[PDB]
Design a protein around this ligand. Sequence first.
Ligand SMILES: [Zn+2]
Length: 126
Amino acid sequence: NCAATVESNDNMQFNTKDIQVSKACKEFTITLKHTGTQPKASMGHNLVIAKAEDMDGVFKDGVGAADTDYVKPDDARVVAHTKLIGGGEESSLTLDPAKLADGDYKFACTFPGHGALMNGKVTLVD
Ligand SMILES: [Zn+2]
């Protein structure tokens, strides 16, 4: 109902490669759960939405941003993002699906190193 739940674990994996977002929604909420037991310092996960072509730059700038969820603040490339979470925690984001109509969007964890394994597509659907 204009909401989806994505899982993440101690093995550097999301449980999906595609998040479908209905453009019939005024707002869409994505909740990330961390089902592992490791702390966010060593196995932190977030969910960060940006154009495929912007994601590499978003990763690189996220490195210097550990105290802001490994996302450079005020970054126009980032449509939305959750907080960084550790084992047993959850964080949500809210976005306007209309913001995704202008490109091909991806999601990833921007915790340094995680992005190559923890990424996928964000897909507008009916
Ligand atoms: Zn992560």
